[PDB]
Design an enzyme around this catalytic site. Structure first.
Site, PDB file in Angstrom:
ATOM      1  N   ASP A   5     -33.443 -21.519  -3.589  1.00 42.00           N
ATOM      2  CA  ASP A   5     -34.869 -21.189  -3.546  1.00 42.00           C
ATOM      3  C   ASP A   5     -35.748 -22.386  -3.136  1.00 42.00           C
ATOM      4  OD1 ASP A   5     -36.850 -19.007  -3.946  1.00 42.00           O
ATOM      5  OD2 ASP A   5     -37.427 -20.005  -5.831  1.00 42.00           O
ATOM      6  N   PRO A  45     -41.981 -24.842  -0.501  1.00 39.48           N
ATOM      7  CA  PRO A  45     -42.993 -25.862  -0.851  1.00 39.48           C
ATOM      8  C   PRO A  45     -43.448 -25.871  -2.313  1.00 39.48           C
ATOM      9  CG  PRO A  45     -43.512 -24.870   1.263  1.00 39.48           C
ATOM     10  CD  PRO A  45     -42.424 -24.036   0.656  1.00 39.48           C
TER      11      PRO A  45
END
Ligand SMILES: Nc1ncnc2c1ncn2[C@@H]1O[C@H](COP(=O)(O)OP(=O)(O)CP(=O)(O)O)[C@@H](O)[C@H]1O
Ligand SMILES: [Mg+2]
Lengths: 272, 114
Positions: free
Chosen positions: A138, A141
């Site tokens: 996963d 940002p």
């Protein structure tokens, strides 16, 4: 109705640092170790719901404790016997800073030098995770924080190798999903290489490589549509840097960087 | 749209009568199959499961395949990520030849005789 002042006799809860999906993160004081910590807890309004408790209990049990300077440390996990029921919690290394998601949204695209340094440090964190048998799965940002001292801190690593069930990474915006994740094909460390490439693309251009009205459209693009070179989307980006981003974003994992350490070496070469 | 995982949003030969077959369509276990010949066939990550599906997203007790009224059906016994039949989330569904069952990251094809 409120949050408890303490999670056991050890953690004194302070201000809320941020919110996740079903969680809230508090700045807390570790009264035993005499240090500031970040405590991720299930939201007070969801605590009495047995479905959220069951989902957050798994998350606390699966929170991986990796010791590395570029990884948010997990010091402790537990369950506080709150007057409103059991409350699971994750005690983390407190990061005084913001996510990469916050920087791209407020500051806009990063300078080539800083963006390279951020992703090179993230590669180090992924390399260490892979050396511990953990694929992140996963990389986005929001899972990378930048401290006040400009330190890169990658978070949300799961325990990977009776084992506790993990959630599907497929749910969300799909902008950082690798083609293999979207398709249900085999997933290895090169999936993290691809996803970090997506993050590197966004910090350089100001937008992720693929965007769409639906997660299906974005997943389709990840699988079949070729990404636009970063230089064509944002000015002042070298061909050598373009070659790095596009190699990490290759469709076949065979053509990508085979290791995160390999991706870091090419980034350091461009940094010169 | 069918090429992706569900979260993104008459019959076959060589099978004994009254039985079915579940075949893994893609991934590391592509080609692996499981014969359904009992009234109840459990599917999950628990070692005692009749259809052992080793994947982090599969629950130890995920689903069961039930042979009721000379036909097969899939039932979710309380998993974390759910059970999907032809990309659609289900609690229970009757299975016809060619149906696709998603348990975790496993894409199983259900096959039965005519
Ligand atoms: N160790 C830490 N130190 C400081 N702030 C932190 C932190 N961990 C998380 N935060 C803050 O809390 C916010 C929410 O955390 P996070 O994204 O990990 O939640 P989550 O795991 O519930 C999201 P999801 O539901 O998508 O999985 C972050 O955006 C950040 O501002
Ligand atoms: Mg999470």
């Amino acid at each position: 109705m409120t949050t408890p002042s303490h999670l056991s006799d050890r953690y004194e809860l302070g201000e809320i640092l941020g919110f996740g999906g079903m969680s809230e993160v508090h700045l807390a004081r570790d009264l035993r170790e005499h240090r500031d910590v970040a405590v991720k807890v299930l939201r007070a309004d969801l605590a009495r719901d047995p479905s959220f408790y069951l989902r957050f209990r798994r998350e606390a049990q699966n929170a991986a404790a990796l010791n590395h300077p570029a990884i948010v440390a997990v010091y402790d996990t537990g369950e506080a016997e709150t007057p409103a029921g059991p409350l699971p919690y994750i005690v983390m290394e407190y990061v005084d800073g913001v996510t990469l998601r916050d920087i791209v949204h407020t500051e806009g695209p990063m300078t080539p030098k800083r963006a390279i340094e951020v992703i090179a440090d993230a590669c180090q964190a992924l390399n260490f995770s892979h050396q511990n048998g953990i694929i992140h799965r996963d990389v986005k940002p929001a899972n990378i924080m930048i401290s006040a001292t400009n330190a890169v801190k990658v978070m949300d690593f799961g325990i990977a190798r009776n084992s506790v069930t993990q959630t599907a990474a497929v749910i969300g915006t799909a902008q950082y999903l690798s083609p293999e994740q979207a398709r249900g094909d085999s997933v290895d460390a090169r999936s993290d290489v691809y996803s970090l490439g997506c993050v590197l693309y966004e910090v350089l251009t100001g937008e992720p490589p693929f965007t769409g009205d639906s997660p299906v459209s974005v997943a389709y693009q990840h699988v079949r549509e070729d990404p636009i070179p970063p230089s064509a989307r944002h000015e002042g980006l070298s061909a050598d840097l373009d070659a790095v981003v596009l190699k990490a974003l290759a469709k076949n994992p065979e053509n990508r960087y085979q290791t995160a350490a390999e991706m870091r070496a090419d980034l350091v070469r461009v940094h010169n | 749209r069918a090429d992706f995982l569900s979260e993104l949003d008459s019959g076959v030969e060589g099978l004994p009568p009254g039985s079915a077959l579940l075949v893994v369509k893609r991934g590391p276990n592509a080609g692996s199959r499981f014969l359904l010949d009992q009234a109840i066939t459990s599917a999950g990550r628990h070692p005692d499961s009749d259809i052992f599906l080793d994947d982090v997203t599969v629950s130890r007790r995920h689903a069961e395949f039930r042979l009721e009224n000379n036909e097969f059906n899939v039932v979710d016994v309380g998993s974390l990520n759910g059970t999907y039949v032809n990309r659609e989330p289900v609690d229970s569904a009757v299975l016809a030849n060619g149906d696709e069952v998603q348990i975790g990251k496993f894409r199983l094809v259900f096959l039965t005789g005519p």
